[PDB]
From a paper:
To elucidate the molecular mechanism underlying the high constitutive activation of GPR3, here, we report a cryo-EM structure of the GPR3–Gs signaling complex at a global nominal resolution of 3.03 Å. We used both scFv168 and nanobody Nb359 to stabilize the complex for cryo-EM analysis. Interestingly, we observed a lipid-like molecule bound to the orthosteric pocket of GPR3, which was co-purified with the receptor from insect cell membranes. Among them, OEA exhibited the best fit into the density map. Taken together, these results suggest that the observed density in the orthosteric pocket most likely represents OEA, which serves as a candidate of GPR3 endogenous agonist and may contribute to the high constitutive activity of GPR3. Further structural analysis revealed that the OEA binding pocket is composed of TM3, 5, 6 and 7, which creates a highly hydrophobic tunnel by a series of non-polar residues, allowing the insertion of the long alkyl chain of OEA. The lack of direct polar interaction between the OEA head group and GPR3 was compensated by the presence of two potential water molecules on top of OEA, which creates a relatively hydrophilic environment. One of the water molecules mediates the hydrogen-bonding interactions between Y2807.36 and the oxygen of the OEA hydroxyethyl group. In the G protein-coupling interface, the C-terminal α5 helix of Gαs inserts into the receptor core, forming extensive hydrophilic and hydrophobic contacts with residues in TM3, TM5, TM6, TM7 and ICL2. In general, the GPR3–Gs complex displays high similarity in the receptor–G protein interactions compared with other reported structures of class A GPCR–Gs complexes, such as V2R and β2AR,9,15 suggesting a common mechanism for G protein coupling.
GPR3 is a class A orphan G protein-coupled receptor (GPCR) exhibiting broad expression across various brain regions including the hypothalamus, hippocampus, and cortex, as well as in peripheral tissues such as liver and ovary. GPR3 has been characterized as a constitutive activator of adenylate cyclase through coupling to the heterotrimeric Gs protein. Two potential scenarios may explain the high constitutive activity of GPR34: basal coupling with Gs in the absence of a ligand, or stimulation by a ubiquitous ligand. Additionally, our analysis of the active state structure in comparison to the simulated apo state and an inverse agonist-bound inactive state models provided valuable insights into the activation mechanism of GPR3. These findings collectively support the notion that the high constitutive activity of GPR3 arises from the combined effects of stimulation by an ubiquitous ligand and its basal coupling with Gs.
Numbering used by the authors:
A (entry chain C): 2 to 340
B (entry chain A): 42 to 232, 242 to 310
C (entry chain B): 11 to 58, 205 to 224, 230 to 252, 263 to 303, 309 to 394
D (entry chain E): 1 to 122, 135 to 248
E (entry chain D): 5 to 62
Write the structure that this text describes.
Amino acid sequence: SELDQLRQEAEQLKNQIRDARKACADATLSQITNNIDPVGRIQMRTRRTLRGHLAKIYAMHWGTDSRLLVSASQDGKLIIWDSYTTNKVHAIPLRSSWVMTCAYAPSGNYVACGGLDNICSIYNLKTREGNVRVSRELAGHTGYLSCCRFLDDNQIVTSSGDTTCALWDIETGQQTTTFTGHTGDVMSLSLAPDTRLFVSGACDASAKLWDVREGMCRQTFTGHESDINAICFFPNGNAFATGSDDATCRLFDLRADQELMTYSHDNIICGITSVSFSKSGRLLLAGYDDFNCNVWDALKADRAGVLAGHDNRVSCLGVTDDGMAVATGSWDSFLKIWN
Amino acid sequence: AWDVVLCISGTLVSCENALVVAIIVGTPAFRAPMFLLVGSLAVADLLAGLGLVLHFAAVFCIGSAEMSLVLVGVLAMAFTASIGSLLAITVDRYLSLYNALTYYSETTVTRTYVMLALVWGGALGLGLLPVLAWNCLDGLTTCGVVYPLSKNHLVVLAIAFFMVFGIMLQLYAQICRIVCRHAQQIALQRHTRKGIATLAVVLGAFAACWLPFTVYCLLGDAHSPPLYTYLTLLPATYNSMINPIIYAFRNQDVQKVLWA
Amino acid sequence: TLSAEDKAAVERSKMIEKQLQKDKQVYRATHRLLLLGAGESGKSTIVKSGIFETKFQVDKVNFHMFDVERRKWIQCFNDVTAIIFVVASSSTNRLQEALNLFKSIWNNRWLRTISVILFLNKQDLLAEKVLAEDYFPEFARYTTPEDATPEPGEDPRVTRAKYFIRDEFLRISTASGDGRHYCYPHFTCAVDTENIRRVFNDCRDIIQRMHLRQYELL
Amino acid sequence: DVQLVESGGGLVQPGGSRKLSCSASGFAFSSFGMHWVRQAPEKGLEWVAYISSGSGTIYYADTVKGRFTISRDDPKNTLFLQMTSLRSEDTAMYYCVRSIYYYGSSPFDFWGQGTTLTVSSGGSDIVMTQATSSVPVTPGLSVSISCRSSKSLLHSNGNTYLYWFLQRPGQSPQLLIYRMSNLASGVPDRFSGSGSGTAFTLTISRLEAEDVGVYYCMQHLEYPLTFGAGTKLELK
Amino acid sequence: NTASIAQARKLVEQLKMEANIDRIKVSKAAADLMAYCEAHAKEDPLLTPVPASENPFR
Ligand SMILES: CCCCCCCC/C=C\CCCCCCCC(=O)NCCO
């Protein structure tokens, strides 16, 4: 029947892809990186602790000026912090207390949030009345929101738990594009440096390189043995890193189209909740469930430090645009600034 | 020459309570009523130790009568604040069980502030008599065992350590009333040492350190041998050494903070 | 040190922290429960867009029970005081799955300090079925525990089966308790109006046991 | 939508007393600190009072301290000024001003209509200097106004608290530049602010006929707030 | 019926598109990530500690 021959064709194509990937691989990154000087011990100390959240912290995002940031917690508050002086610029109450993501508009006029309400809420920070108002509510997803990222003041990409991403137009509220093809729930996404591409990792242990313009899955990457919780582009937008429940990080390269390096150790057995890079893409700041955040040497995979100051699991972390400080949230309701 | 032993004991007590106070103050997370009361106890013990060191130094180097008279009142305020912090901690423990559900409201903070204010107002009220109201320098007012304090004050401050022990024991009896029920319920569907050991440690050390002096102060005068008043005031400092270990240094979070 | 404008910013920060404290004062005054169970378990009978919150007040204490593909979201709930678990006393042999589900809850890493209230629903159906077990061969070698206090006018076989199910749950309950959390079982029928006081008392003695363990008295 | 309507003006005999009210409608009143700023008839602006958000800080000018009392009523959205023992120098038009302070905000960005008060006949403060006080211009030509300060306004944190206001004939002032380089909201981008330390210059390009009025500089570095004499732009 | 053949054929075009790309050797796709890091290493605060004089969080 058609089904059988189609199955043989599909498995033949899969094996051909695997064989091509194997052929393209000649020298590993580790072999080439045998002569570069080691990074050396990395010592980071806390500089600010931001208290005021009532419950666990779910998401965190910097501003583009490297000074303001926004955080969301279980209590239903979205708080804007002036990291330099530890001031509360804004405190926004949420209609729904189940929020799992937050974003800060690259221009700085809006913030975004969402969660188990399946709706993405956009808040205007610069009203003429002197307050903060709900600018827009985007609905249409059939599942909970996992991540959202602004492209500009008018466009925002969102990833839901129904295995589909989206690309909205905020003025109207209608999805100009839809991305489908994942098997499980999508847990994260990461816009490219130029905003022309983005990736996403799902519960099916796979990552897909999408295309915002039209919406075709350019490439698919596999190799993780469990869910992928966090994803991030390399600073040059020509690679990315994925963190999963199997206590391993993986560095994928888009051009070669296969895994390059794995960051793991036997004495590490906990999952990974968040990853981030450094301004030069030489450090990889993973966030584990054992309350710590190892600092991997991206080009050698040999650890170079730890950020051990949190009393509970680290649920999110981020690095500023200028690469001057790294913020980390956690389930004890405190954000910490490090450098 | 037991004064040297007294001074070194005071120094050790002060060191322990200073460590406790530093640990409590350093962490901004420890601001619950229990931590406030424990810090109050630690501060009172530290003040008592410092007073005992200063009086040894004064009577050893600076032979000033006014300094000795002030410090033999400071130590009397410190060891009345420390034995009032315990009765405060115990009334906090019994309402954190009688009111397990509403224990995390704001009324508990108000009662903690009220207890602290009424703990320190009494240490001041029954620690100013050795200097202000009645002394042994003149007046012939039935001078007590200790060098400058009247017998009446030292009887009043023995009737207190008895009333404050009786209430404490009553409240711990009421607590055991509940502990037994819970232990029976747990053992029912599972088919004593911990409770007994903890109660004995926290209620026998307190008694077996402040009953000797509190009885000497009622059955003695200025004609008794001096060593007696040195013999019955070592257990008092031993209790101030013990209390930090029992309370502050047996909490999981405090121990974790200490390990760092 | 501060400028004329930075002082106003700090004043705004303080006036925000004031409202944050005012909200925290009410956040801690409520007890959060996680009602759980299957569609036919009987959750709807007990209640007397993926989340169904609820509010009620018992003796001036406010509760925030909210009824809720479970491996992820339930993991973010390590702050509740008690979990209300509803099971059906009738064995397709989906009951085993319930047991498995219970097991998954008990051994979860982030739910090792949350005690579980257990409701064993549908007593009338179980009694009718027994009067009119077979799927668990171990029921043959089971004797009613002496502590049992069966209701009057009840056949001993119904008591045998009922306590067999209850102890089957308590077996996995007591395996690795470690003293940080326990299980509070109840035999709730279809028409029962006291199910709220049971949750009230179980939530009270959960906290009493936590405190006692803090003081080393238990 | 935003309105600040002042009332309670008129004729007063010397030594009397009066009350001025400011009804605010169209914005979150409780989130804004408020100022009373007065202008004598043939003179420039002069700061008078200040009451912060929540009534937690009240400042007065040295010329009115003791006599004038400022207050606010948030529930009904009103701002009050009580004046007692009125001299003959308290003849002026009073303006109600709003101001919000947080990181990156724009203080002094809305002025009320203002109310007139007439009374029948019977130090270490920073001084702002506008040496030039008149400039004739023609449409299509670039202008340059200047302000000078007795003290360095550049604060340690990196700010420079200087403001620019434009009053057209018959209308209340209007914010143009805040902190000497940040253009306000709703102002054409031809205006630009510059300066360093103590000398500041406002440059205008593509001048039109709707830019005729008096231009004031103000300092917010430390209280009291001090205005300039006021440069005037004349039509050719 | 129709759904199975439809999804199978759609996966067929998807596999065609994915396999029609032009891949490069890892030896070159890995040297770029080295050159990028070496070039931009200087202006990387977290990598190279900076004196507290110009550290905003000092
Ligand atoms: C609201 C709480 C009130 C609780 C009251 C508890 C009773 C006081 C217990 C003990 C107080 C004992 C005071 C001893 C005085 C020491 C004199 C001295 O050091 N002499 C050295 C010179 O040889």
